[model samples]
Target: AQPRETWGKKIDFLLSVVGFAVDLANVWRFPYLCYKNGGGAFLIPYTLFLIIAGMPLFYMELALGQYNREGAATVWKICPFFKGVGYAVILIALYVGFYYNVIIAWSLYYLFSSFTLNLPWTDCGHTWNSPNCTDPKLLNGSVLGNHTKYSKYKFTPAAEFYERGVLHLHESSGIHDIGLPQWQLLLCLMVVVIVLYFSLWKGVKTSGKVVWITATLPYFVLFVLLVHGVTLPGASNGINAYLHIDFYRLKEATVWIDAATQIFFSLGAGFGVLIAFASYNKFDNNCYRDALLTSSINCITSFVSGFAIFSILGYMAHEHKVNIEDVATEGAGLVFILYPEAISTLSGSTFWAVVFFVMLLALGLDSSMGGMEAVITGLADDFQVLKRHRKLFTFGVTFSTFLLALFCITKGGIYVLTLLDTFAAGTSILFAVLMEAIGVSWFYGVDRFSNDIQQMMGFRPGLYWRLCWKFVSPAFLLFVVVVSIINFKPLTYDDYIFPPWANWVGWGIALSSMVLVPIYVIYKFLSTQGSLWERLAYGITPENEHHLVAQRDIRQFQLQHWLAI
Candidate 1:
């Protein structure tokens, strides 16, 4: 049986799939990674891994879904014993869909705030401002005895606005505070879910139409901002800082690992999004090419977005008369604090603020839509009953996700978001990708998979992809996972350390996603009737022979050819 649906246009598939991979990370996360890991020097490792590992895995997943025409869960019918791998992917999507929107909610709150003439975060007189609060304009000179100085003992109004005004956050507090949900954020979260629901309620029907706006508009915004950013007084310094290369940082193993990890996440691998999105393609579509195009575009988008981001950082650092390093930040700080603080200094600050945050919303919403589709489609595949009532299923999934996300809206919600962000996606995603690499490239057999792609695309992949899939990619992913485990540190947000029990809870979240693989393997073993060796054979056998024919036939043919050799 074929997939029940296919994209209305090839462009829809391209936009949605690429848009999913192009996310806040492209804007917020990648720029920081670039600056911290030897600036332009970082791209060396990044580009290398994108070829050897990132694109290989991305192609593997897109092909797997398109060939099988199944969502994350059912697509693994090719290896029923490892079906839990699909479930693990879905679980990560769920975890992401839950808290990821909290960021969107925060963006909405800021987007609304941007409509004002004098942006709130631009000033020091807000209720959240501390006695120590010092304007960047004032701190530029007197205290440092030099026009060029970075203040260390003050909070920017942007930071104060996010922590105090928006979150009502108490300093150094753990998750125990569990304060009531901020009403404004609650409403903003509602708007986010509503937007998501409408964007994806009819699955690709709605999402397909929406991507034209949500996916493509950001580039226009990014280019416009990039132009504005470079035009600023100190823009050259920030751009210079962004591209500054240090050869020595390459010697450190951490730089390579960080680059590898960033590539892994930046392409949206291991989240089951590529699989879910590609499953909607026409069976004969050249998803191999699509994968290459989409993945490359995502990387390019990150590089370009970096200019828009760092140019502003340069302006902020210039205005504050500080080293770009002092004003530079990662993750939430880059978006909520530095960017806003910089925008406020621009002419017609409110207009720029609205455009910036709206761009953020667009970036975040694309990822969120892909995530929700992964969950909804995976569930619908598992429970055929749900597929018949997709509208209801989508609603239930969205509503439940919103309810879980409520925890992040509390005064202490940033703590929860941080924990979920660190433990849920960070820990399990590597293991998931490694398993996927092994499953298709090793267990499913690389030669056979390539042949399947050849059948669809009318040409075999080059020698580069074949070797990467068989050995280089899997080995690299394993190395990263092992090193990450060896160098594991408990999660922390700046100075706030999660207690031991909370750390355990974080571990639980990680284990919850990973443990599914073994649990399902055992379930498959126990349910099969055979001698030990026969059971082992049966366990590896796929569930749906029909679905596995294209995948398995080539594998069997290649195995026989090798045996004859």
Candidate 2:
């Protein structure tokens, strides 16, 4: 068996795993989706979905990993069909591990650049700057039109919280190229690999303190930025745009997709990554409490980020003499690229710059740490590769992941990013989550599982927990997976539309990790030497009264034979 998380107390494991689920994506993606969908109005469906989608699934994942105390794949040996869900998770974790590091690298670049005390954007008309912002007509094309100033693509005053800016076209010139420079991306990936490696290299002992520090420190930076941001001249405008509800957006298909995706990303489902983290948990850990805390904190933080981000954005739009709509970057652009450059120009620029990047760094570190731990747990449990030279085994996995990430850091990374977001981690996570909910709710027996949780948590769960475990979670996940697949759009940055053939590339990337899990499980199953009935009655089938007949018959026959003797 692999080593347990003896490095820290059980709560430490809970915090580390929960911390990963509540990272920068919550800060960047959730609030924007909320604002875009219905501003305060989005909270209605969002909270509803949160209970069904976020918290329940979070608890199920924790429960499965802890109860089985195995890596993702082995944990699902409860039924052959459930193995696929485990694979789906492994795939998502690998995708996040490889490409997510690219985003962290961008954060590092921005952090370093922020310290220069020279906002490259402070003066207009530099080589990097877009053309004049004074023109009322917005610039659209960076290739064909007059110079643009802000993110023209995200211009959406029609949607209410977003407006197309005065120099909308120029925003692309300044912000559209979102990734780190190739060299910078590689360097940043290396740093991430190193941080993740060291944290887990010695096991949870090394990681526990690291997580405690990294998880909590970002709030300080957020506090500093928040104060500076709300004080800016146009900060209120930015705040208004983000806070203003576009009731009509509620009718749009993409708005729902965005909210669902945000919940998936923030809650850390479908990654199978959480499975590995939770594997370290004791069989009786209070995962429900952890789930509740993680979800509440994550939701609150997203709202806080909206204020922090838009406050500065409001300031930047004011500084540039443009409407808030024109300056907003869509998707991940707002956090990684736009925020860094925007923060560099404000009053107390140096202080804010340091704080901003530090926040990003803390987020990136904690997020990557979870992915790294997942990899470690898998190797230790599934393969037993670490039995002899454990450190070397971890180091080897870290190095391999690092090298793979290097491929994702080059010019090709932008293309890879789209592929992963569209198909791999983005799509597969939902599917995996659905499979998990089904496995736990139907296959595992809901009441028994809740009873187990009740014992572990030292309190009977309210009806809410029972309902979530049985009916609500499975239905919610199914709805999301169906909706996501039906509404799937081609991910693009600029005019670089992925060709039809490239769609296969994304699917292949998602399937790569998923393909391994079932194969290994089947192989292990076939290798076992046992009667079919015996094997089925073991952990694979339902552990209820019906299966007890076989046991009772066996006992009766044995007792009768003894009496005859």
Candidate 3:
């Protein structure tokens, strides 16, 4: 058996965790959700879910990984049958890395584009520009006066650059014809995977603090961007749009659901990445405070990045004499098109463009590292041979991610990325985490979990955490699962609808992980030697944690187990 490694210092662990949690979504997705879902009033449901559901779940995972010191999969030795759920989440993290690293590669491409003096996307007279994308109409300020600036037919220079110049998206029709991967993006992904491979192979001995400092770069750039941005024209209105309280909007169920889903994705808890991160912590480390610290950092980063984002958005609005909503968008469209479009108009366009994409690159790197690390650490711990040949294993894993993501870098790659984004991580993650909460709370026992926490940190969990663990978190997850399915519409990217086969493949990606728990249940029941009661009892009881709990009770099916901790 191989021994495990510990972090060099608490601060290094802190940086890695915070870096993982405060991802690209915190910058791009959160601000849009906040703007769309009643502005400042959205925080009510956001904070509500964070307290009753997110915080408890975050703390539980941290404690689980710390106490057990295992990967996502092997940690399930605490309760044997739920081992499949661990395997399921391991695959989820891998699937997420497949497309996620592509986004970072995109930033690398944009970063290289910023080296020129005149920003490439400033005017639309380029070879890539369509007839509708002619220079004179917008550059001469005619479209602004005519109020045709928002029309769909006339694409912005930034949009043209992102779609035509960079993506070569016009070469293919849709997901059905995802043509060859663009060489630019493919090379960038190769660079990204190489960086990821080294980070894992030489993890923590030398690059521990180097990676920590590298992770801090995004916060530095955001501050620079915010200071520069707030001085620009129309920034006040952008911030106003962000902070505008729509109490009436909160009455709508969709707003609540948005808050739920955003926090679920936002906290980065459900993917099993947190479990892998916390597994490196010293047993007695105050992970309770670390949870509060990093989680708040994640949420607050989302809020503050709002200022940086909307200020440019506001600047764009002012330049075009349009409302913030006219210029505002979400996801890749906002980052690649609108934000860089605004940056090109700035005084030191090159410098600002570099700064902006650097922040994007920084944000993408740490989060991608977190997801990939989850795969590495999870599999390494579950299978001993992997742990023994870790560097080669790391190379194999990183290369697989590179190979898998080639489809996403194709001319029609955005559609595949959208499909994976929609199905791979949404309902599947929520359901996986719901089962996780149940596996620990009901089967292995919350009281036993609390005792495990005390064994490490010398304090039992309070009533609030227990209550959230046993009831509230799982209930909230189930509610989101129901609402997520109900709200599911067919996938689309811009005006292009996903064909029927693509949608089926999307669900196949989803249910492939979802069925593991029940399938493993049947297999485990058949494989184990026991009577019906005996099998059922052993199924819920933890195999390795009996020493911690002392005389493990197989009373999970009893009334007292339901009514009392």
Candidate 4:
């Protein structure tokens, strides 16, 4: 074998992990969720989930990857049957990359679209606008009930540019009617893929260096935006709304469910990126500290970003003389359409548009790089040939995702993008983490797992973490997964409900990765040469160790092995 590459510096690893965790969702989704759920009251469930389920699972993966010193797929030397959990996440990462980069492309287009003196999204005079948006010119941009705007869905000029001009959603009636690719959008997507390729092609050394800008610039820009956001006319009102506590919201089940999923996805456990990132750390790098610090930073960033976002939404609400809820929203519309509309209303608008889009670019770049790095790192460690020609392999991975993203850049691509986002990782990701927690804390033994952390960080995990890992975390994940399905509705791209066939396709996308686990279990059982019980033991035990896959002398069949923890 080979001496593997490690992070360039401690800060490099810290920045990389933070960059991955604090992604586009931190800006778009979390703040809106807080507003929608209960303002400050939402923090109760969010913080509880973070401590009980989020942090334990996060810390486990870091220690597991660092102690084993292997990628997600290869890192599963503790139990081979569960190795499928590793591939399951790697596949989830790939599915995410397919559309995730397309989001960056959207940002890039908006950035490129920002270059003109007159911002393209500012007026209804553009060819993309219908007569209704033009008729509203006498009004002060207030009162948009999509159903109420001139009777047939009132789209603001900002929404028109996003849907009509940029996405050209008007051209295709539905998901089944997806038209030809928008060549401009395709070009921007290619650029995003290229940036991702260069940033990740050389392993942690290269990726760690790129984080110098991609990870850090967003902070500086965010500070600038928040400072500027506070000066807007109704900014204080927005902040007040954001901070206002409504205890009644806590009584609702959906609020709890939203908090649970937001914290989990926001901290970004279960996708295997944490494992891949920690695998490159020094043997005794104190990932125990890294896990706590980075994970805390991510949640805090999510909370703080709400202040920046809501303040602006408040300004829009006050200026339009409408209720705050009327202007407030989530998803691409909030950032791309809503924010652009607000910026155009301000003077020095071009500068604001340029700066905001650049911030979006930086956020998207770092997170996209992390997603791509997870796949390259996982596969490269598992297959030596990939590590041997990483530049070519990274290009191959990017090229394939680029091909898939073609569907998302097509005229009706928002429908396709919506489907991918809805199903690609929600429950599937929750399930992977559940299996991983089980594999590590239960199947592999929490006592044994704690010892690995002690060996690396010079201390044993406290009973609180071990108890959560074995008991609390799995049950927490199971409840979230159960509710996620029970509460499901077919996704709507604003007014358009996706067809049943499209929903089925989304289910198939989710199932494809999840099925790998049981399939691999059967494969391992069939290949082992022994009696039923022995085969069970053989498939469940590590072949040996590598620090441990290197020198295992005991087998699971030994009664004491099962009795150790």
lDDT of 1 by residue, 101-136 (tens): 888888888877777676777555653334333454
Model 1 regions lying over 4 Å from their true place: 1-3, 25-28, 127-151, 327-331, 544-565
Error of 2 at 215 (Å): 1.6
RMSD score of candidate 1 (Å): 3.4
- Which of the two candidates, 1 or 3, achieves a greater TM-score against the reference? 3
324, model 4: CA deviation in Å? 3.3
C-alpha lDDT score of every prediction, in listed order: 0.75, 0.63, 0.77, 0.77
Candidate 4 structure lDDT: 0.77
lDDT of 2 by residue, 1-565 (tens): 4357653586577667656855745234555566667665676777776666777778777777777778886676555546655655654676677767777776675565556656433333332333344532322212234235444643222111111111122223322243333555667777877777677777767777887877776667777667777666677777777767666657766567677777777777656676777776666667777878888877777767777767766775665544555445564445654564564455576777677677677777788777767766765675665645667877787787777775456544556655675677666776677767766766656666777677666776677776776777778777777786786676665434556666777777766755665675567557556776555444345334336645643221243422221
Question: By lDDT, highest first, what's the ranking?
Answer: 4, 3, 1, 2
Please write out the lDDT profile of model 4 over residues 379-479, one tens digit for every residue.
Answer: 98888888889899989988999888899889888788878876877967988988887787667888888877777687898888888787888888888
Q: What's the distance in Å from true for residue 557, model 1?
A: 14
Error of 4 at 252 (Å): 4.1
| Displacement of the residue 300 alpha carbon in candidate 4, Å | 2.0
Error of 2 at 423 (Å): 1.4
Give the clashing pairs for model 1. Answer: none
Identify the superior model by TM-score, candidate 1 or candidate 2.
1
